[PDB]
Ligand binder design. Structure first.
Ligand SMILES: O=C(O)CCNS(=O)(=O)c1cc2c(c(O)c1O)C(=O)c1ccccc1C2=O
Ligand SMILES: O=C(O)CCNS(=O)(=O)c1cc2c(c(O)c1O)C(=O)c1ccccc1C2=O
Ligand SMILES: O=C(O)CCNS(=O)(=O)c1cc2c(c(O)c1O)C(=O)c1ccccc1C2=O
Ligand SMILES: O=P(O)(O)OC[C@H]1O[C@](O)(COP(=O)(O)O)[C@@H](O)[C@@H]1O
Ligand SMILES: O=P(O)(O)OC[C@H]1O[C@](O)(COP(=O)(O)O)[C@@H](O)[C@@H]1O
Ligand SMILES: O=P(O)(O)OC[C@H]1O[C@](O)(COP(=O)(O)O)[C@@H](O)[C@@H]1O
Ligand SMILES: O=P(O)(O)OC[C@H]1O[C@](O)(COP(=O)(O)O)[C@@H](O)[C@@H]1O
Ligand SMILES: O=C([O-])C(=O)[O-]
Ligand SMILES: O=C([O-])C(=O)[O-]
Ligand SMILES: O=C([O-])C(=O)[O-]
Ligand SMILES: O=C([O-])C(=O)[O-]
Ligand SMILES: [K+]
Ligand SMILES: [K+]
Ligand SMILES: [K+]
Ligand SMILES: [K+]
Ligand SMILES: [Mg+2]
Ligand SMILES: [Mg+2]
Ligand SMILES: [Mg+2]
Ligand SMILES: [Mg+2]
Lengths: 424, 425, 436, 419
């Protein structure tokens, strides 16, 4: 069977509670997290975190997305930081147990509309193959359309994460989210534009609306601020990280902590440690019930398969949901239901593998084998690749149950199958 | 379309509370889904003619009950032959053929402590004549079920045992009886004489709730449409009783004197069909599905895991049906236990499984008669297509509908593990 | 366990095994059903009123005394049959049987008198026979009118006009008997005092298999509105000739109570049947079992969630009193009322505690039988010089009568609902009292 | 539209979060008490007057620092600042005095703690924040050191290590309340686990109906900066959303450059966070988990809170001798302010430990007839309520009183229309 020890770990006694109050009362500091950390860490790359050797330590510590702030530096400076990130990432390609995709995100300087510097920085992003744009001071839907147009003929696959930094962006949130790939709660400017005591309301509202929409949301700025000069964070800082994860954030971010601080690697390690504890403390029973109740009926087979797979994973405490995805969409639709099971996304697209770090609980595996002539064999090889990588990484063991999500024919947009396998 | 959301009590289905769900029930909201609660009709002088049996099958009879408290082995053998003749008269059109189970209802222990010698002989008769189900009278403890199982011998291992709870001891030892039984019958006739009449509804509701929690079939029986033995229309209490048995969660409803000896056997079957269909649409699935999931324990069985995923998927897209391939009926039973609003169309080659799955609410059995294709994946597809073609002919499905298809990874029973979202073309 | 552990130690495990209390503590409706126990005996007084139709089999004073002791709370006179002279004699016999118990005020049981109209027939509105029967009702001091075939709001206005200026106090319960009445339900309920789900005609006017939907919908809407709802016709039909009912009949009575009906009715079962007293006894027995089986945890939660916010102090006091009664497993809620309204507002929240309504109005004492769980006590003493002392005497009358009738025991907690000044409409106080 | 009422009406917690509005202004009085540590930066009578106006409800004296003479002078300055507002009885704000012990250090009750606890009794302190409580016998030792004269002093056990967290239930059982002392807890257990201990202890205290304080580094950067970090405002808001009855300032008020601004910031955040509480789920869960009871004060409290929610009552006015009737109302977390009218100056100060309890110290002449005396204490609550902005003409209030004088007899709830 599973054993009594299994049910004492990852806050499983608190998970079985009948009320949110009882769930809190059952949280246990001795109940150790077992699942892989699912909230991605975005680290801003700057003077303190630029070297290839330092970047290798940040990747090992848990950095999933490298942020380049175009409010500072230059094209030449950021291109060198990007090259160093890619060199550090590819230094682990020799071993399957250490290689991890790392997304590259460009954060714009900001604005009467799209600034000349933003047009040129967005063009630099397309030319350097960036995965994501964190668009500063998005105030309305037309600001997103301008960023989308500036991404030109080659950059339509780049994700646009609109940064909400002022009163107008909060008030026009629904129209901005509708046309964006996701949102960043940019608390630095938000805390100066609106009263500081109201930022938590904007953060919780935007995270809840993004969770309802199934779109990624980033919590940002001053999460571990004191760690710019101190080796350990304050009590308010660790609670801020934990509460951003409990709020429903897909990603958490470090700015000055990694760009200029004295402890960049330790700041990444601290966010990794807290996120893992907070993810186990999520009250999935109410969260899943409310996400299902609020999500409308759907005739899209990817959406229908995703909810069935997440329900199946909860039923058997599945060690993972393995999904085949080319664009990342099938993995994103699983992630929106917040399964406790890790979502292992097997893809041939290097860009999709980097971009899916935006979605909580998605573990990308880039697959490079040549295509099989028999499509069903190519699918089976990718599914077994997900299982063998899962075994190698500690996600899975023989005897475990996994949920497998595929489609009936090749090409993006046909996901319609959920299977229960049993690991051999 | 807007019309879709006005039918089958869908406005009441979207309510946030059970009280508001009741307030939104609409007598003009017509039922669309096929009737999912099976009807058991007791065979007798009123329902023994082969031609009358054909009318009862068309009216909705799913299970024919043989009451061994009346008549000899020669009488029951003739009843079996007549039922089979009426059932097989429709086998020439495989897309519309309806299997009908045959249940043997034992005489019982009488004044004895356990299995009577007449019951031993009747049970052996049942095995020799290939009955599908045994309704075991006056089950008081787990050893009564073991005795019935032993009397069926090695040749009757596939026969379902439905324990009839008819007295105080059976109600008190319910948990141990349900554990070893395939299902239960709330036998209200004797129960209403053995315990105070005003307490029977508590025993009925409790046993139906516990069977629903266990995922095992439960039958509500006796005097449901009693006045229809002599009158063409039932009383207001009788229609209410049928509707409330379905709302309680009964998998099956039964007719005794109404079909065995009365003057309106076909009309009694038609009345139970009409009421059950209305009551099934009035079920508050939002609370029911939530509570069945919450109470059901975690499972490592792939059939169980696939079943809950398929039911969740069916609710998400308002699937017209869940088509499942099954050898023993188990994969269909595990879908049924989650009470989907979507019809569970079970395709099987086992004639016995097709008859027995009528015990599970919402399971529509289709008996597949074609010999196996050389390529197993093609044989599976042909059976799924047979489910689709039968569903289109019977009115379950139309082009454009979404259906959930439940299959397994290898031949043989026990390997269901796949759920697939399919658009009907 | 922790939510009931201290009270289980104080009241004992036997207390928590009775009146379906294990099923009452369940966290889901499914678990509540699984925990229903035929060995869990009902303890509370029967709260769903029984309406018995008075006719040839139940007319004599001696027979009526047996029916009052068996549990009849409302006597129905069907003006579709008999005559003015016949029904006046039945009414006099009912009053004689009722007043035979008036010698002991601390046990006297009021019985309401209801007139059921013949109806409009093939006409579009109020018939001439109904005008005469309604005038008879006012002249004979009837408490309630069961108005046949109500199809729209103007039908109830016509009944109200026919009762004249002297019948303003008479309750109008509109009978819903056809498709139009069901479709125009909301406008009818708005102007009526309550509703009767008259299933006999309803089962002929709409498909028989749809009556349960109309019954459950109308009971739910009346529960939401806080207005009385009666379930009627063929509930124990076979008992017209047999001494025991069918399994569908007991189920029907139990399910009408579980649906939320305030009253249940007997027609031919008491008017002409061989076993009128046994039919009343059977409805009494089933209703007590079914009331205990109600899942109060979900019901109370849903009644609060659906009921809008209120600035009426009687309404605010009523929900606070019902919440307080549930918190301590109160034996009873004693309320002082002039019109019955404060008791009706307590009843709408469906407390498990009996609502003992102390009133000086003989008519209000009879009419409150329409509201589930209201036990009327007619106070006959002249007013004390100091109003606060008069209030206290009335509360003590409720306590002493409660102890004498078996509702209250020493050590019990009772909730007492009173107002801040004399006259109807000023209830605003809730008190927790320990019985000594 | 105000006080996050659109988010309050939501059918799910997720929809409640989606409906939170930065333009929906808080209207209710700030419910979560602020504990400020008094030290070099906040000692003067003039500075203490500004801290009282900014919202300080409890003055903490940390006996790990200073001396008996130093802390006695701080206490005298607190009392002088508090009494400077006594000339207007309808607006006077009581302020509690809390002694935080040095602790056991090496190893039961230290000899320094015995002397400091004696000092506390002699100086009439209201509360003891007992450091490093790891078992029930630590609480008994503190209680014994307070002697027969300190029977009325509240003991709030500070949970600062692994043992205190593991033996939480036995500690809470014998304590008046708890302090989640995150400074030591954050080095005694892994820093990334403190939030689990905080949320668990707050939840268990809420279930028990006993006060819980969130403490340490809440607005840390404000020791040198005029504005806090984004993590610090979030931390204050989340402690209130977690269910904390009190929030605390240590170095921020004891030695920092912006003590008054730190108090103002905690006041501003707490008020916003209290309106963002999802009362629909919270009341339902507290009401479901609170055990059945035959105690009339407990029965009246749930009836009164239910009644207040039904009519959107502006306040629940309660008469209390010890603070207990107000504490039992507070445990159900009403949105309505609990205005507690008491003659006990000590109970008025101590009741700041319970969220949403606004103490009014009654100093009007006694009425000859007890029923009239009760009525004038109720009218005093109404007049103070109107002057402070809690109540207006036309509002509905719930009034909670007892049937006889003396503590322990609360059994009446009344619905009253203002003016
Ligand atoms: O708004 C602010 O002032 C805070 C910005 N927070 S940050 O995005 O993490 C940030 C980014 C950067 C730096 C920071 O110290 C810093 O803190 C640099 O010194 C720097 C120097 C030269 C080239 C590039 C960088 C650079 O990219
Ligand atoms: O027709 C219907 O659907 C209603 C019948 N159900 S009843 O209202 O209870 C009912 C009422 C009555 C009778 C009934 O047999 C009867 O059954 C009488 O014989 C009778 C005889 C003489 C005077 C008066 C009555 C009299 O009032
Ligand atoms: O970090 C800790 O270990 C706790 C310190 N946080 S505190 O309790 O608020 C605190 C308290 C005090 C001081 C602080 O600077 C301080 O910060 C003093 O300078 C001081 C000087 C002279 C007499 C008394 C005090 C005095 O009481
Ligand atoms: O998430 P996406 O981008 O829609 O991709 C999902 C697709 O992946 C598959 O599972 C496998 O497709 P490929 O063989 O083309 O990679 C498809 O059946 C399904 O449509
Ligand atoms: O419900 P059961 O009895 O377990 O049968 C389900 C079985 O039916 C199938 O779908 C088809 O099997 P067969 O081809 O042997 O009929 C299997 O893959 C699966 O194991
Ligand atoms: O339920 P009703 O009709 O409003 O009557 C309640 C009234 O009864 C009382 O309790 C007593 O009033 P009386 O003294 O006039 O009988 C009033 O204080 C209260 O307003
Ligand atoms: O909250 P506590 O300490 O029990 O005090 C409540 C007490 O206060 C009162 O309302 C007023 O009593 P006093 O007149 O003695 O102040 C009592 O009736 C009640 O018992
Ligand atoms: O731009 C940002 O990241 C901010 O303002 O927090
Ligand atoms: O045997 C039966 O069916 C009964 O007693 O109801
Ligand atoms: O009128 C009635 O009572 C009926 O039709 O049921
Ligand atoms: O003593 C304290 O307050 C601490 O350690 O946080
Ligand atoms: K920027
Ligand atoms: K039999
Ligand atoms: K009539
Ligand atoms: K200290
Ligand atoms: Mg910014
Ligand atoms: Mg029998
Ligand atoms: Mg009629
Ligand atoms: Mg400490």
């Amino acid at each position: 069977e599973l054993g009594t020890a299994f049910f004492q770990q990852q806050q499983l006694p608190a998970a079985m509670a009948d009320t949110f109050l009882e769930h809190l009362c059952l949280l246990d500091i001795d109940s150790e997290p077992v699942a892989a950390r699912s909230t991605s860490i975005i680290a801003t790359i700057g003077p303190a975190s630029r070297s290839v050797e330092r970047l290798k330590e940040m990747i090992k510590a848990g950095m999933n997305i490298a942020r380049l702030n175009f409010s500072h530096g230059s094209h030449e400076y950021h291109a060198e930081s990007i090259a160093n990130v890619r060199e550090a990432v590819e230094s682990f390609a020799g071993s399957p147990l250490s290689y991890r995709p790392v997304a590259i995100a460009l954060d714009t300087k900001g604005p009467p509309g799209l600034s000349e510097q933003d047009v040129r920085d967005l063009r630099f992003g397309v030319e350097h193959g960036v995965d994501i744009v964190f668009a500063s001071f998005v105030r309305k839907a037309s600001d997103v359309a301008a960023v989308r147009a500036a991404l030109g003929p080659e950059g339509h696959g780049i994700k646009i994460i609109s940064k909400i930094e002022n009163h107008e962006g909060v008030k026009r949130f629904d129209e901005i989210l509708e046309v964006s790939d996701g949102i960043m709660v940019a608390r630095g400017d938000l805390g100066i534009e609106i009263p500081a005591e109201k930022v938590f309301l904007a953060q919780k509202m935007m995270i809840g609306r993004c969770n309802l929409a199934g779109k990624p949301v980033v919590c940002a700025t001053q999460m571990l601020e004191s760690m710019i000069t101190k080796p350990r964070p304050t009590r308010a800082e660790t609670s801020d990280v934990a509460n951003a994860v409990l709020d429903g954030a897909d990603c958490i971010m470090l700015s000055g902590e990694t760009a200029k601080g004295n402890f960049p690697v330790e700041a990444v390690k601290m966010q990794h440690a807290i996120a893992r504890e907070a993810e186990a403390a999520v009250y999935h029973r109410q969260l899943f019930e409310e996400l299902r109740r609020a999500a409308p009926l759907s005739r899209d087979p990817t959406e229908v398969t995703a909810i069935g797979a997440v329900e199946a994973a909860f039923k058997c405490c599945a060690a993972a949901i393995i999904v085949l995805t080319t664009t990342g969409r099938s993995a994103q639709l699983l992630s929106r239901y917040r399964p406790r099971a890790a979502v292992i996304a097997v893809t041939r697209s290097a860009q999709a593998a980097r971009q899916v770090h935006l979605c909580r609980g998605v573990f990308p595996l880039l697959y490079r084998e040549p295509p099989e002539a028999i499509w069903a064999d190519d699918v089976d090889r990718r599914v077994q690749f997900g299982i063998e990588s899962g075994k190698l990484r500690g996600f899975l063991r023989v005897g475990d149950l996994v949920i497998v999500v595929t489609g009936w024919r090749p090409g993006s947009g046909y996901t319609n199958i959920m299977r229960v396998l049993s690991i051999s």
